[PDB]
Design an enzyme around this catalytic site. Structure first.
Site, short mmCIF file in Angstrom:
data_model
loop_
_atom_site.label_atom_id
_atom_site.label_comp_id
_atom_site.label_asym_id
_atom_site.label_seq_id
_atom_site.Cartn_x
_atom_site.Cartn_y
_atom_site.Cartn_z
N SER A 89 -11.35 -36.91 -9.57
CA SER A 89 -9.99 -36.41 -9.39
C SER A 89 -9.09 -37.47 -8.76
O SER A 89 -9.53 -38.27 -7.95
CB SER A 89 -10.01 -35.15 -8.52
OG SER A 89 -8.69 -34.76 -8.17
N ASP A 118 -24.35 -22.07 -15.89
CA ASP A 118 -24.29 -22.98 -14.76
C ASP A 118 -24.18 -24.43 -15.24
O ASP A 118 -25.18 -25.04 -15.59
CB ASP A 118 -25.53 -22.79 -13.88
CG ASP A 118 -25.56 -23.73 -12.68
OD1 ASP A 118 -24.54 -24.38 -12.39
OD2 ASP A 118 -26.61 -23.79 -12.02
#
Ligand SMILES: CN(Cc1cccnc1)Cc1nc(C2(O)CCNCC2)cs1
Length: 330
Positions: A199, A35
């Site tokens: 992004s 994770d």
């Protein structure tokens, strides 16, 4: 040193991925959920409430000759899906695909929430976010990657998650045969303890690219792609019959619909998520309504590039003195 381990989807929907991990002496192999969004290595164990264990393989510290109780240390964590777990702490030897760390903090669960209990295939988590997020009190503990980093050939690990297929976690090296084209690296903020990056935008299907900054985290421990309500609305608008359902808790769509791809920007590079990656099957057994793999982050507070996005790329988690993230097509 280097390490390399095969990671496997837990079910037909790629709801999560497990990776075999060796703990203790002699080795106890548990299948852990790697994770990159948390920083606790915790396991089902001999100490877990009997009613809260159902099929999981358990760590038994009393049978590990290298296990030592960390006096006075506890842990307690709650994840973004409302799940949680808690217990005490041992230090023990831990190995992943041939890479060994001695004196790793292994957090033994006393309690686990119902979601963990009900998932027989996941024996615990191995956190790979930044160690500032570790929940061990009164003394915070280091992640497996942080513990291994100085020994690695290069201070990195890579995630290569498969769509309906096996994949790979590597430590200490970059397998240049695992991707196509080049790896595009992008800046990382560790200010929230996450692999947090920005992004450069998105496109839906064959639509034109929309340049817009989307701050989010690379999180292998989250199944879906969580993005701003505006972006998510624009995606599902291209799916005939899709709508946002309050009862179901997200966007759903007719199961026979054709899903468009979703592209996200990494600097000037583009990662394309094929339409069927976004399909998470009937909302309930036998239903012709399907649950969508792209959902709004509005109630979360943060955008999450979970497995749906990450498995479309070869992802480099560069833990150099200034951390960066790398994405390549594959
Ligand atoms: C298939 N998903 C979408 C969905 C929702 C509702 C209906 N149909 C599909 C939901 C799931 N999420 C999980 C996990 O959250 C994965 C990682 N943490 C443990 C459980 C398992 S099933």
């Amino acid at each position: 040193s280097t390490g390399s381990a095969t990671t496997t989807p837990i079910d037909s929907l790629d709801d999560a991925y497990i990776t075999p991990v060796q703990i203790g002496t002699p080795a106890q192999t548990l299948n852990l959920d790697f994770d990159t969004g948390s920083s606790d290595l915790w396991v089902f164990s001999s100490e877990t409430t009997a009613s809260e264990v159902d099929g999981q393989t358990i760590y038994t510290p009393s049978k590990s000759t290298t296990a030592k109780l960390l006096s006075g240390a506890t842990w307690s964590i709650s994840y973004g899906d409302g799940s949680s777990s808690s217990g005490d702490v041992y230090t023990d030897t831990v190995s992943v695909g041939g890479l060994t760390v001695t004196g790793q903090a292994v957090e033994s669960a006393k309690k686990v929430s119902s979601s963990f209990t009900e998932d027989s295939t996941i024996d615990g988590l191995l956190g790979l976010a930044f160690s500032t997020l570790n929940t061990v009190s009164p003394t915070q503990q280091k992640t497996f990657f942080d513990n291994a980093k100085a020994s690695l050939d290069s201070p990195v690990f890579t995630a290569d998650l498969g769509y309906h297929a096996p994949g790979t976690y590597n430590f200490g090296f970059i397998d240049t045969t695992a991707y196509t084209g080049s790896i595009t690296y992008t800046a990382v903020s560790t200010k929230q303890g996450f692999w947090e990056w920005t992004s450069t935008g998105y496109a839906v299907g064959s639509g034109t690219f929309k340049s817009t900054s989307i701050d989010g985290i690379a999180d292998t421990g989250t199944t879906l792609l969580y993005l701003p309500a505006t972006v998510v609305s624009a995606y599902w608008a291209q799916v005939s019959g899709a709508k946002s359902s309050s009862s179901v808790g997200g966007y759903v769509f007719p199961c026979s619909a054709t899903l468009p791809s979703f592209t996200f920007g990494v600097g000037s590079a583009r990662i394309v998520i094929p339409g069927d990656y976004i399909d998470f099957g009937p909302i309930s057994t036998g239903s012709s309504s399907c649950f969508g793999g792209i959902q709004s982050s509005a109630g979360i507070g943060i955008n999450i590039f979970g497995d749906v996005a990450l498995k479309a790329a070869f992802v480099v988690f560069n833990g150099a003195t200034t951390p960066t993230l790398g994405f390549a097509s594959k």
